[PDB]
Amino acid sequence: MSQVPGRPESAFAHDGQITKSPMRALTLAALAPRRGELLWDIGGGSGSVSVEWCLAGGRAITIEPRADRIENIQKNIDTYGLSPRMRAVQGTAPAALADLPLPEAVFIGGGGSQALYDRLWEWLAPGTRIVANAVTLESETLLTQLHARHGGQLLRIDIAQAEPLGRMRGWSASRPQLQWSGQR
Amino acid sequence: MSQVPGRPESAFAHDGQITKSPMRALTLAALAPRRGELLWDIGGGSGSVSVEWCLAGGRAITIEPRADRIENIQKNIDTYGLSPRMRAVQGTAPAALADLPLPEAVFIGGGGSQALYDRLWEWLAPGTRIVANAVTLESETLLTQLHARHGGQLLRIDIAQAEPLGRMRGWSASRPQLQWSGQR
Amino acid sequence: MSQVPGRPESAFAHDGQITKSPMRALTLAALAPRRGELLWDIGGGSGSVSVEWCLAGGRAITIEPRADRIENIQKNIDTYGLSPRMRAVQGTAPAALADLPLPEAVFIGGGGSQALYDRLWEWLAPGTRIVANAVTLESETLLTQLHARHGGQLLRIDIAQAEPLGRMRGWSASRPQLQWSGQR
Amino acid sequence: MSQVPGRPESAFAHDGQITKSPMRALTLAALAPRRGELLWDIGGGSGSVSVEWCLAGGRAITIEPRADRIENIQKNIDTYGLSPRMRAVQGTAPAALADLPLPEAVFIGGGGSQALYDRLWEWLAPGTRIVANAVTLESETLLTQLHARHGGQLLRIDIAQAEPLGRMRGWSASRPQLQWSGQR
Ligand SMILES: Nc1ncnc2c1ncn2[C@@H]1O[C@H](CSCC[C@H](N)C(=O)O)[C@@H](O)[C@H]1O
Ligand SMILES: Nc1ncnc2c1ncn2[C@@H]1O[C@H](CSCC[C@H](N)C(=O)O)[C@@H](O)[C@H]1O
Ligand SMILES: Nc1ncnc2c1ncn2[C@@H]1O[C@H](CSCC[C@H](N)C(=O)O)[C@@H](O)[C@H]1O
Ligand SMILES: Nc1ncnc2c1ncn2[C@@H]1O[C@H](CSCC[C@H](N)C(=O)O)[C@@H](O)[C@H]1O
């Protein structure tokens, strides 16, 4: 079992919603976990980002509304013997982050609206690290405005795979993603 | 300091030829270090891949012809106290590889030719993992051929960054890079 | 000489600010000249869009503030004997637009601000076609907003070219460009 | 009806196989038709590239094996009153090009193997223009080798559209295409 992020999708329980391995390698690079650091993983999903954060030696709380997804998250905590360093929390951000200890880092997988970012600026200790991925055009202008307001690094990421087609190979149909890496 | 690959380019002595931090994350994700595994790093440059591979628990031999770049590799060995774990060899592949112990993984950022690959193909223990980045049409073609012959994974990767443009921002002008990841 | 848009950049007097030939093809495709239709070309530069629009049978008014660039527009008018069909106006939109007859189509390669668009929105006959290229994060955001408000088509476009790289070839480093095409 | 290439897909009879409008704008830009010039459109499909070549004032022969596709091609000749400037030919290249008059330009939509390119170099008058689009990795290395051997322009083209997803917008999943524009 690998000592670095980007571990296969199949290292995790998940439905058809999971940060794909190369994106997750990028995401963890930007999160930059130090040992014992806390992360709020807003979005959650399969919790795979949290899992790699914890395997790098971090502690993580992983917020997620959907019940089916929370089961997957929980299986992944057990599978990696991650209690109590990682906690699944069933809820919806920002509301679900009201009664939680302040973190050193925040990952906005999913749920990234202005209301979230207003609350975050209201609730978080200055210099708390933020990392966000956006796949919609609306999420993208949001990350672009955040980068205008507060600086940081803003990356545009395109990754495709080679695949069958049908006696030949093609590039898999790809979407770019924006990622913002900043503070506060 | 960060517990995962893709640390900033300033965490390393380098001369301008370093592997960019997000690409370094992707590569290490493909290399997938397990504790104590050995890496051949062909085309060391400033040795950043090897440093992050060894920081994840591996050992590495780093092959670079240029004495001035070797010196930077040496500093990174020093900085991170990796001398038990990490060796520099001044030289050219394939000649410099000939008396080395066989690795568990190989990385080619260096001058990857068909010669190098035929030699690697003859020498390597079956199941040894290979990872290569290409940034020329000629080396990309080569990876695609390698992929057609041997399988594994072939990724096309484009990463840009938000850069100044007068009082405006613009995407930095990037090249896609091809990355093959296979074995044997 | 070629009967379609996207003629080489050498078929025009220009100063370095010209629209690239493949982008000029895409733009004219979006503009879709019918015989005798009128174009407002905001941000003329060297007037290449207008030249190709008028060569397809249209008429155009070309708006550029810089006297030295106007001179290049003038040469292209001369070269192609377009003076009955094509006018240069030295100035800035929106002021320079105020006494012009209303067009059948408008192209903004020029300084496209929200001001310009509010004014264009008030002045223009409903069904007038609009086409804009963006190369900054700020102008791209604007196009996306325009798209959300008004519909039409929004394309993301990346074009690179095979360039030397020592004795090897590599892709030239390009930016994506956003292009909106709508009406009213 | 527009005086330039890139006309909508729906301006043509076609099954689910047709050069998409922006690609076709690019393709015709590179073909550069002059009035009365002959084109072999190898591939054929719906014949849309031929149709725009002829509407620019060119003559075209359009080779295509599949019977269903040839009906579409023929409907497009009738619809645009293109007889006899455009001829549908049911066959398979290179064989199907044995008894045909020599052209000024060649478009390799589909069917682009080495056998084709060996025959073409054997059958065509020096300085005959070639334009080719490739979507597979094998077709791409072929166009890359052709560019090594004979120069010309080699472009990498990525175009995406904005589209629903589901209360938001996404970029449509896109494949890059290589296009070679050369001679002989
Ligand atoms: N307001 C909100 N707060 C928290 N999570 C939300 C949310 N809105 C949507 N989500 C969740 O965000 C997830 C999408 S992202 C899933 C991928 C995940 N990052 C992974 O690595 O596995 C969905 O599971 C969705 O239920
Ligand atoms: N035949 C060969 N054998 C070993 N190294 C080579 C080589 N040809 C070129 N190289 C080296 O490969 C380097 C380019 S790649 C440098 C990036 C490196 N992976 C890093 O992270 O720092 C150059 O320094 C060059 O000297
Ligand atoms: N407010 C404004 N009104 C009109 N033109 C403007 C403007 N601001 C900038 N421009 C012009 O827009 C040009 C950049 S775009 C040049 C490309 C042009 N379409 C061509 O094919 O040649 C510059 O020359 C600049 O002077
Ligand atoms: N050897 C060959 N010779 C000629 N046509 C071929 C071929 N192999 C495949 N084709 C055809 O090439 C077509 C794919 S391309 C279709 C898009 C077309 N360029 C258009 O603009 O409408 C298919 O119709 C296929 O039947």
PDB file of C-alpha atoms in Angstrom, chain A residues 2-128:
ATOM      1  CA  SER A   2       1.320   3.376  -1.191  1.00  0.00           C
ATOM      2  CA  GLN A   3       2.857   5.965   1.159  1.00  0.00           C
ATOM      3  CA  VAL A   4       1.555   8.912  -0.961  1.00  0.00           C
ATOM      4  CA  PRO A   5      -1.806  10.404  -2.161  1.00  0.00           C
ATOM      5  CA  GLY A   6      -3.273   9.571  -5.556  1.00  0.00           C
ATOM      6  CA  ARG A   7      -4.019   5.984  -4.423  1.00  0.00           C
ATOM      7  CA  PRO A   8      -6.448   4.183  -6.820  1.00  0.00           C
ATOM      8  CA  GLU A   9     -10.194   4.898  -6.688  1.00  0.00           C
ATOM      9  CA  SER A  10     -10.611   1.218  -5.769  1.00  0.00           C
ATOM     10  CA  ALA A  11      -8.713   1.673  -2.528  1.00  0.00           C
ATOM     11  CA  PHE A  12     -12.018   3.190  -1.328  1.00  0.00           C
ATOM     12  CA  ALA A  13     -15.688   2.431  -0.839  1.00  0.00           C
ATOM     13  CA  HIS A  14     -17.607   4.941  -2.982  1.00  0.00           C
ATOM     14  CA  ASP A  15     -20.624   5.147  -5.269  1.00  0.00           C
ATOM     15  CA  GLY A  16     -20.131   6.861  -8.620  1.00  0.00           C
ATOM     16  CA  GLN A  17     -18.799  10.023  -6.869  1.00  0.00           C
ATOM     17  CA  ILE A  18     -15.156  10.256  -5.822  1.00  0.00           C
ATOM     18  CA  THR A  19     -12.232  12.570  -6.491  1.00  0.00           C
ATOM     19  CA  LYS A  20     -10.306  10.769  -9.282  1.00  0.00           C
ATOM     20  CA  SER A  21      -6.769   9.777  -8.270  1.00  0.00           C
ATOM     21  CA  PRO A  22      -4.741  12.336 -10.137  1.00  0.00           C
ATOM     22  CA  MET A  23      -6.989  15.215  -8.989  1.00  0.00           C
ATOM     23  CA  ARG A  24      -6.719  13.960  -5.406  1.00  0.00           C
ATOM     24  CA  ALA A  25      -2.898  13.890  -5.697  1.00  0.00           C
ATOM     25  CA  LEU A  26      -3.060  17.572  -6.735  1.00  0.00           C
ATOM     26  CA  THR A  27      -5.594  18.406  -4.023  1.00  0.00           C
ATOM     27  CA  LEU A  28      -3.441  16.897  -1.220  1.00  0.00           C
ATOM     28  CA  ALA A  29      -0.353  18.625  -2.559  1.00  0.00           C
ATOM     29  CA  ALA A  30      -2.209  21.956  -2.116  1.00  0.00           C
ATOM     30  CA  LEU A  31      -3.737  21.076   1.282  1.00  0.00           C
ATOM     31  CA  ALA A  32      -0.156  20.305   2.503  1.00  0.00           C
ATOM     32  CA  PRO A  33      -1.011  18.299   5.689  1.00  0.00           C
ATOM     33  CA  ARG A  34       1.402  18.442   8.642  1.00  0.00           C
ATOM     34  CA  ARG A  35       1.148  15.797  11.363  1.00  0.00           C
ATOM     35  CA  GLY A  36      -1.872  16.150  13.689  1.00  0.00           C
ATOM     36  CA  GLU A  37      -3.437  19.035  11.706  1.00  0.00           C
ATOM     37  CA  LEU A  38      -7.235  19.342  11.485  1.00  0.00           C
ATOM     38  CA  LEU A  39      -9.152  19.441   8.185  1.00  0.00           C
ATOM     39  CA  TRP A  40     -12.801  20.198   7.454  1.00  0.00           C
ATOM     40  CA  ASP A  41     -13.671  18.266   4.278  1.00  0.00           C
ATOM     41  CA  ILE A  42     -16.850  20.027   3.131  1.00  0.00           C
ATOM     42  CA  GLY A  43     -18.383  18.011   0.375  1.00  0.00           C
ATOM     43  CA  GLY A  44     -17.294  14.658   1.742  1.00  0.00           C
ATOM     44  CA  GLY A  45     -18.609  12.212  -0.897  1.00  0.00           C
ATOM     45  CA  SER A  46     -16.640   9.000  -0.289  1.00  0.00           C
ATOM     46  CA  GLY A  47     -14.336  10.921   2.030  1.00  0.00           C
ATOM     47  CA  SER A  48     -11.333   9.886  -0.044  1.00  0.00           C
ATOM     48  CA  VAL A  49      -9.641  13.282   0.339  1.00  0.00           C
ATOM     49  CA  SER A  50     -10.017  12.980   4.087  1.00  0.00           C
ATOM     50  CA  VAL A  51      -8.647   9.469   4.046  1.00  0.00           C
ATOM     51  CA  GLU A  52      -5.458  10.559   2.265  1.00  0.00           C
ATOM     52  CA  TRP A  53      -5.227  13.592   4.603  1.00  0.00           C
ATOM     53  CA  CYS A  54      -5.345  11.249   7.615  1.00  0.00           C
ATOM     54  CA  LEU A  55      -2.957   8.665   6.103  1.00  0.00           C
ATOM     55  CA  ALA A  56      -0.500  11.598   5.754  1.00  0.00           C
ATOM     56  CA  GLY A  57      -0.866  11.907   9.541  1.00  0.00           C
ATOM     57  CA  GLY A  58      -3.687  14.465   9.799  1.00  0.00           C
ATOM     58  CA  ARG A  59      -6.987  14.568  11.692  1.00  0.00           C
ATOM     59  CA  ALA A  60     -10.161  15.199   9.672  1.00  0.00           C
ATOM     60  CA  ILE A  61     -13.890  15.925  10.054  1.00  0.00           C
ATOM     61  CA  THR A  62     -15.826  15.068   6.842  1.00  0.00           C
ATOM     62  CA  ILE A  63     -19.262  16.708   6.382  1.00  0.00           C
ATOM     63  CA  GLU A  64     -21.808  15.136   4.024  1.00  0.00           C
ATOM     64  CA  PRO A  65     -25.658  15.309   3.778  1.00  0.00           C
ATOM     65  CA  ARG A  66     -26.467  12.106   1.894  1.00  0.00           C
ATOM     66  CA  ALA A  67     -26.885   8.983   4.082  1.00  0.00           C
ATOM     67  CA  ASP A  68     -25.624   6.484   1.415  1.00  0.00           C
ATOM     68  CA  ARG A  69     -22.380   8.454   1.016  1.00  0.00           C
ATOM     69  CA  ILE A  70     -21.849   8.571   4.845  1.00  0.00           C
ATOM     70  CA  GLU A  71     -21.870   4.748   4.986  1.00  0.00           C
ATOM     71  CA  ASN A  72     -19.047   4.753   2.370  1.00  0.00           C
ATOM     72  CA  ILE A  73     -17.132   7.399   4.330  1.00  0.00           C
ATOM     73  CA  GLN A  74     -17.526   5.272   7.503  1.00  0.00           C
ATOM     74  CA  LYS A  75     -16.399   2.011   5.803  1.00  0.00           C
ATOM     75  CA  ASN A  76     -13.281   3.961   4.731  1.00  0.00           C
ATOM     76  CA  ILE A  77     -12.585   5.079   8.317  1.00  0.00           C
ATOM     77  CA  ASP A  78     -12.835   1.465   9.561  1.00  0.00           C
ATOM     78  CA  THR A  79     -10.873   0.006   6.632  1.00  0.00           C
ATOM     79  CA  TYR A  80      -7.943   2.362   7.352  1.00  0.00           C
ATOM     80  CA  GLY A  81      -8.265   2.099  11.129  1.00  0.00           C
ATOM     81  CA  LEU A  82      -8.807   5.809  11.286  1.00  0.00           C
ATOM     82  CA  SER A  83     -11.014   6.306  14.349  1.00  0.00           C
ATOM     83  CA  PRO A  84     -10.969   8.685  16.014  1.00  0.00           C
ATOM     84  CA  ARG A  85      -8.577  10.812  13.822  1.00  0.00           C
ATOM     85  CA  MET A  86     -11.420  10.930  11.259  1.00  0.00           C
ATOM     86  CA  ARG A  87     -15.121  11.553  12.052  1.00  0.00           C
ATOM     87  CA  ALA A  88     -18.022  11.272   9.619  1.00  0.00           C
ATOM     88  CA  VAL A  89     -20.671  13.993  10.171  1.00  0.00           C
ATOM     89  CA  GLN A  90     -24.046  13.880   8.481  1.00  0.00           C
ATOM     90  CA  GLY A  91     -25.169  17.408   7.759  1.00  0.00           C
ATOM     91  CA  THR A  92     -25.116  20.367   5.443  1.00  0.00           C
ATOM     92  CA  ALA A  93     -22.611  23.245   5.427  1.00  0.00           C
ATOM     93  CA  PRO A  94     -22.510  25.989   6.611  1.00  0.00           C
ATOM     94  CA  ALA A  95     -25.162  25.017   9.224  1.00  0.00           C
ATOM     95  CA  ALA A  96     -23.416  21.690  10.025  1.00  0.00           C
ATOM     96  CA  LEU A  97     -20.149  23.431  10.954  1.00  0.00           C
ATOM     97  CA  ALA A  98     -21.595  25.482  13.813  1.00  0.00           C
ATOM     98  CA  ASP A  99     -20.622  23.106  16.659  1.00  0.00           C
ATOM     99  CA  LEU A 100     -17.141  21.959  15.406  1.00  0.00           C
ATOM    100  CA  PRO A 101     -13.586  22.721  16.597  1.00  0.00           C
ATOM    101  CA  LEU A 102     -11.665  25.251  14.493  1.00  0.00           C
ATOM    102  CA  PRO A 103      -9.404  23.708  11.833  1.00  0.00           C
ATOM    103  CA  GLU A 104      -6.004  24.408  10.323  1.00  0.00           C
ATOM    104  CA  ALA A 105      -7.274  23.556   6.813  1.00  0.00           C
ATOM    105  CA  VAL A 106     -10.493  23.472   4.780  1.00  0.00           C
ATOM    106  CA  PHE A 107     -11.316  21.571   1.605  1.00  0.00           C
ATOM    107  CA  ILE A 108     -14.314  22.548  -0.431  1.00  0.00           C
ATOM    108  CA  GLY A 109     -15.008  19.481  -2.493  1.00  0.00           C
ATOM    109  CA  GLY A 110     -18.705  20.255  -2.859  1.00  0.00           C
ATOM    110  CA  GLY A 111     -21.354  22.775  -1.629  1.00  0.00           C
ATOM    111  CA  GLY A 112     -19.302  25.909  -2.459  1.00  0.00           C
ATOM    112  CA  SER A 113     -21.596  28.957  -2.474  1.00  0.00           C
ATOM    113  CA  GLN A 114     -21.094  32.579  -1.319  1.00  0.00           C
ATOM    114  CA  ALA A 115     -23.021  31.867   1.867  1.00  0.00           C
ATOM    115  CA  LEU A 116     -20.445  29.199   2.675  1.00  0.00           C
ATOM    116  CA  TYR A 117     -17.553  31.599   1.993  1.00  0.00           C
ATOM    117  CA  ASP A 118     -19.176  34.440   4.027  1.00  0.00           C
ATOM    118  CA  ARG A 119     -19.627  32.127   7.042  1.00  0.00           C
ATOM    119  CA  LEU A 120     -16.107  30.713   6.598  1.00  0.00           C
ATOM    120  CA  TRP A 121     -14.595  34.174   6.772  1.00  0.00           C
ATOM    121  CA  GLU A 122     -16.763  34.833   9.826  1.00  0.00           C
ATOM    122  CA  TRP A 123     -15.966  31.554  11.648  1.00  0.00           C
ATOM    123  CA  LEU A 124     -12.327  30.718  10.822  1.00  0.00           C
ATOM    124  CA  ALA A 125      -9.102  31.869  12.460  1.00  0.00           C
ATOM    125  CA  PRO A 126      -7.047  34.074  10.067  1.00  0.00           C
ATOM    126  CA  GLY A 127      -4.405  32.076   8.177  1.00  0.00           C
ATOM    127  CA  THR A 128      -6.543  28.877   8.081  1.00  0.00           C
TER     128      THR A 128
END
